[PDB]
With several copies, the nearest count.
Chain A
């Protein structure tokens, strides 16, 4: 499971400051994999937080506690 290359390409191009900027095919594949890691880490960390506070599920409160360090790690 994971992100499609075309999706990731469009997301990145949304944000480039210069219309000249392009992304290599190999770089695009690495970005597909890196976004997967990011999302899975968010989920897994959220689950760890929920486990730690004996919550019934990962809700936003749990997620929020893990976000600062997640972003530092990416």
Chain B
């Protein structure tokens, strides 16, 4: 089904990211942990999407832009330094 496929795609990417961390940190993740992180990530997209949409509407836009995403990424000041430094290089095209 539609959402099963999306979750599988997430789970694959999460597995790959966790593998990279595991390889780097020399610490294994259980299969259950990887699945939980995939599920967490799928659910977190629900919150990101609603917030983004509200931030856009807040500025009277129906199309979500980079300012909406940077507002989203405000949470941590270290999260903020990344989003502002990663909006420039993509915007180097």
Contacts and interface: CB of A to CB of B under 8 A. Distances in A.
Given A2-B17, A14-B45, A34 B90 contact: no
Given A27-B69, A47-B21, A73 B79 contact: yes
B17 A58 contact: no
Nearest to B29: A58
Given A24-B65, A43-B37, A59 B52 contact: no
B33 A60 contact: yes
Chain B interface main SS type: helix
Q: Which size bracket describes the interface of B in this complex?
A: 35 or more
B20 to A, nearest CB: 6
Contacts of B14: 39
Chain A interface main SS type: helix
B60 interface: no
B16 to A, nearest CB: 5
A17 B53 contact: yes
A14 B6 contact: yes
Interface in B59-80: 62-66, 68-70, 72-73, 75-76, 79
A27 B64 contact: yes
A37 B72 CA distance: 13
Contacts of A26: 65-66, 87, 90-91
B25 interface: yes
A47 B53 contact: no
Nearest to B27: A47
8 contacts: A2-B13, A12-B52, A15-B45, A21-B64, A24-B66, A38-B41, A42-B40, A43-B21
